[PDB]
């Protein structure tokens, strides 16, 4: 016959097309709500500093929950305790980068590899542009470039991370499923820095590049990708 | 049926309209415009009639063929390209042809043509170069302008007019087009003092003069 068998094919096709359209409206409004949340997160740490200075007290802001490590010293001649920490940070090649949340279990790992990494507190623009330009994904333990939202949504759908700004929100606003969202991300293959390093061997305090350079990691990121 | 209106939003930047989709819904007025729901030719012959099959099958097959290509999108043919001008080249400027047989001769520019080329005459009465086409990359444009807003160049001369044919003897239509255009152009350049002597001379880099330091 192929009369109703024909039409139910395009019934099912139209059904999944409308399903895809409802999903796109979903992630549109999720991105809008995120933009509102980031406006509030930026303005409230100005608001509360102002209300502290208005009384004459001081407002200590919260210690940040998210750093971005970069491996600035190469393979050769690495002490093994410094080596295993880098393997758990997934900084294997030179000039790889990884988002890392902070706590006492992680800062004492980062100080073991302080001569070899440069790390600081990455800005919202940094967490955006790293994902969009250099952000890939460990899909089926392969390395597939994040070209469409389905590559994110098939791997991270059960953590309710189904577009790319969901991934950006989970990385930046460090969420509940940060471990899974970050271990989804392949380590960032950042290029050698344009302009050039100050000094590879010594710490940032003593005029170098190794170690914690807190707000200044963004200047490094902008010229490394 | 229906008269096709132009685009409702103005283009803000390329690929972005100035009105989002709610205002575009309100403007296009879809709130009230809701809708809901060959190969055989018979011929007589002088038997009966024959059903001839137009576009019949091939009589030969090459022993192997290539496959079809994948589809790409933003790759127009050359006629469908958008065509750029420089900022310095406006109709009325004077040009320095750098490459072809008219080496370095200063020339009045007339019209951006439809293949992308530049319509050219420094009038051949003084620098001996006809209605010619040139290319805007190969041409230095100095900042010496005449006003040719009040001239008419003929519509019938175009890229298909100046296109080469196949000894080249010139036609009489070239002569009458040249004599029609320069009779309007040449009294304009005779108005500016020492410009007709400027156009006869050739650009030449001498000693101690450098194009990065010299302005024009």
């Amino acid at each position: 016959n192929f009369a109703e068998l024909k039409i139910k094919r395009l019934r099912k096709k139209f059904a999944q097309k409308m399903l895809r359209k409802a999903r796109r409206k979903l992630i549109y409004e999720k991105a809008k709500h995120y933009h509102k949340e980031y406006r509030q997160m930026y303005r409230t740490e100005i608001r509360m500093a102002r209300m502290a200075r208005k009384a004459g007290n001081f407002y200590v802001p919260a210690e940040p929950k998210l750093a971005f490590v970069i491996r600035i010293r190469g393979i050769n001649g690495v002490s093994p305790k410094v080596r295993k920490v880098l393997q758990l940070l997934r900084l294997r090649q030179i000039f790889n980068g990884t988002f890392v949340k902070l706590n006492k279990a992680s800062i004492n790992m980062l100080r073991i590899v302080e001569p070899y990494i440069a790390w600081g507190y990455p800005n919202l623009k940094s967490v955006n542009e790293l994902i969009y330009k250099r952000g890939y994904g460990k899909i089926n333990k392969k390395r597939i470039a994040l070209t469409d939202n389905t590559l994110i949504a098939r791997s991270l759908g059960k953590y309710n991370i189904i577009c790319m700004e969901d991934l950006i929100h989970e990385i930046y606003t460090v969420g509940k499923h940060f471990k899974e969202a970050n271990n989804f991300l392949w380590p960032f293959k950042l290029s050698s820095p344009r302009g050039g390093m100050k000094k590879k061997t010594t710490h940032f305090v003593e005029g170098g590049d190794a170690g914690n350079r807190e707000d200044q990691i963004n200047r490094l990121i902008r010229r490394m990708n | 049926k229906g008269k096709p209106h132009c685009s409702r939003n103005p283009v803000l930047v390329r690929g972005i309209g100035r009105y989002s989709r709610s205002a575009m819904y309100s403007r296009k007025a879809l709130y009230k415009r809701k809708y809901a729901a060959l190969a055989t030719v018979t011929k007589p012959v002088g038997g009966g009639t024959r059903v001839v099959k137009l576009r019949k099958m091939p009589r030969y097959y090459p022993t192997e063929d290539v496959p079809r290509k994948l589809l790409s999108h933003g790759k127009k043919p050359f006629s469908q390209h958008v065509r750029k001008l420089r900022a310095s080249i406006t109709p009325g400027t004077i040009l320095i042809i750098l490459t072809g047989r008219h080496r370095g001769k200063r020339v009045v520019f007339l019209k951006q043509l439809s293949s992308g080329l530049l319509l050219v005459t420094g009038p051949l009465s003084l620098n001996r170069v006809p209605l010619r086409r040139t290319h805007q990359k190969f041409v230095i444009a100095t900042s010496t302008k005449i006003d040719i807003s009040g001239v008419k160049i003929p519509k019938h001369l175009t890229d298909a007019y100046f296109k080469k044919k196949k000894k080249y003897e010139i036609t009489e239509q070239r002569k009458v087009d040249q004599k029609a255009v320069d009779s309007q152009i040449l009294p304009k350049i005779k108005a500016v003092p020492q410009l007709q002597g400027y156009l006869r001379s050739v650009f030449a880099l001498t000693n101690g003069v450098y194009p990065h330091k010299l302005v024009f």
Partner: peptide, 19 residues
């Protein structure tokens, strides 16, 4: 609406509504 199990009648209803 957007997830396919429970939002099926809602997507069908908005499909009827977009005519």
């Amino acid at each position: 609406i957007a997830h396919p199990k429970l939002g099926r009648r809602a997507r069908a209803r908005i499909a009827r509504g977009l005519r």
